[PDB]
Design a protein around this ligand. Structure first.
Ligand SMILES: COc1ccc2cccc(CCNC(C)=O)c2c1
Ligand code: NI
Length: 341
C-alpha cells in the first residue's frame, strides 16, 4: 500500500504512486517523469486521471497505451487549477519531460515536490523566486559529500573530443552508445553531430525518441543501421562479448569499436578527473565509462536547499535504512545552522 511520502496531505493527490492499486481517497495521480520505478503500474486498463507534462503524456499514450481520455498534460511555468487546487509544473533538469510540482494547499501551506532533479542556479529565477515553501519532498539520491562528479557540459566535451579523435585517426571505426531508459540523449546526439552522422537504433528506441519534442529529430536519428556510424544498443550489450557480436552483423564495414557506457556516480570519481579517464580495452574494442549524471551532486543539492529555506524536508530516496535517514537529517541540520538559522 501507498507510503506516506507519496501522499500530499490536504488534497486528494498522490505523486508517482501507480503500483499500489486503487489508492484510498485519490482523485488525481501525478507522474513526475517517465522512468520505470516511478510509472510502475500504468497501462491501457488505467481509468483514473493522470496529470503530467506534454512529453510524459506522449510516452504514456504511445509506449504504455494509456487511453487519451485519462491523460491530462499541463504546460510548464503556468498556474493551473486541478480539482480546486492551484498547481505549477517546473522543469526538473532530469530526463525529457521531467517536472517538479508546486502545490498551493487550501490552508495556505505551499509544498514543492522535486521528483527526480539535478539542481541548478537557474531554478533560483523560476516561479520559485520569493515563494515561501513549507514542505520540500527532496530527491536525495546523492545526499553525502563523497558524491562528486563533473558538469554535463564537461562530460560531453570529453565524449565529443574522444570520438572525433578516434574516427579521424581511423575512418573505419564504429561508435556505440549504451541506453536503458530515457535521459542522457545529449551523449549520442553530440557525438553524432560532430561525426556528421545520424544515430542508428532499433524500431522500439526510435519510437521512444519520436515522443520527446526534440527539435529537428527526423534529421538526427534513423532505423537504417547501415547508413549510420553511431549506433545505440541496449546497455547490457556494452561489454566485450556483446560488442564483438555486434561487429559481426555490420558486414565487414568496420574494424574497431569505440563504446560509451553512461553511468551515474562511481567510486573512481574520488581519484580520477574526467580528462584522465581511460577505457577498458580488448583487441580492437574499447569501452569508456562516463559519469553523466541527471541527479544533483551533494554541492548542487546543498546550494538549492540553502537558497529555498524550506521549513521541513521529507527525503524521497535512500529512505530504507536507519543509517541513511540519520545521515540525511544530520546534513539538513548542518545546512540550516550554517545558513544562520
Ligand atoms: C529543514 O531543513 C532545512 C535545511 C536548510 C534550511 C536553510 C534555510 C532555512 C531553513 C528553515 C527555516 N526557513 C525559513 C524561511 O526561516 C532550512 C531548513
Ligand atoms: Ni528518474
Amino acid at each position: 500500500t501507498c507510503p506516506f511520502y507519496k501522499k500530499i496531505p490536504g488534497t486528494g493527490f498522490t505523486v508517482d504512486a501507480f503500483q499500489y492499486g486503487v489508492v484510498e481517497g485519490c482523485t488525481a495521480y501525478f507522474l513526475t517523469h517517465f522512468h520505470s520505478d516511478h510509472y510502475a503500474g500504468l497501462s491501457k486498463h488505467f481509468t483514473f486521471p493522470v496529470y503530467c507534462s506534454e512529453i510524459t503524456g506522449n510516452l504514456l499514450k504511445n509506449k504504455l497505451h494509456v487511453q487519451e481520455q485519462y491523460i491530462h498534460p499541463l504546460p510548464l511555468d503556468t498556474e493551473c487549477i486541478v480539482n480546486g487546487v492551484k498547481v505549477v509544473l517546473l522543469d526538473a533538469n532530469h530526463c525529457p519531460g521531467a517536472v517538479m510540482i508546486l502545490f498551493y494547499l487550501p490552508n495556505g501551506t505551499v509544498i514543492l515536490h522535486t521528483g527526480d532533479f539535478r539542481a541548478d542556479p537557474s531554478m533560483e529565477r523560476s516561479l520559485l523566486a520569493d515563494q515561501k515553501v513549507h514542505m520540500l519532498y527532496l530527491d536525495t539520491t546523492y545526499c553525502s559529500p563523497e558524491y562528486t562528479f563533473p558538469s554535463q557540459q564537461e562530460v560531453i566535451r570529453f565524449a565529443i573530443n574522444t570520438a572525433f579523435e578516434a574516427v579521424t585517426l581511423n575512418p573505419h571505426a564504429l561508435v556505440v552508445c549504451g541506453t536503458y531508459s530515457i535521459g542522457k540523449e545529449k551523449v549520442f546526439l553530440a557525438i553524432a553531430d560532430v561525426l556528421g552522422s545520424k544515430v542508428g537504433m532499433s524500431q522500439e528506441k526510435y519510437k521512444t525518441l519520436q515522443c520527446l519534442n526534440i527539435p529537428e529529430i527526423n534529421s538526427l536519428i534513423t532505423t537504417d543501421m547501415c547508413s549510420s556510424l553511431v549506433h545505440l544498443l541496449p546497455m547490457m550489450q556494452i561489454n566485450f562479448k556483446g560488442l564483438q557480436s555486434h561487429l559481426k552483423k555490420c558486414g565487414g564495414k568496420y574494424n574497431q569499436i569505440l563504446a560509451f557506457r553512461p553511468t551515474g556516480w562511481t567510486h573512481s570519481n574520488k581519484f580520477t578527473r574526467i580528462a584522465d579517464v581511460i577505457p577498458q580495452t580488448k583487441g580492437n574494442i574499447s569501452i569508456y565509462g562516463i559519469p553523466y549524471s541527471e541527479h544533483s551532486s551533494y554541492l548542487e543539492m546543498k546550494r538549492f536547499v540553502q537558497w529555498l529555506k524550506p521549513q521541513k524536508i521529507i527525503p524521497t530516496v535512500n529512505v530504507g535504512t536507519w543509517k541513511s535517514r540519520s545521515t540525511m537529517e544530520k546534513y539538513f541540520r548542518e545546512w540550516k545552522l550554517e545558513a544562520g538559522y
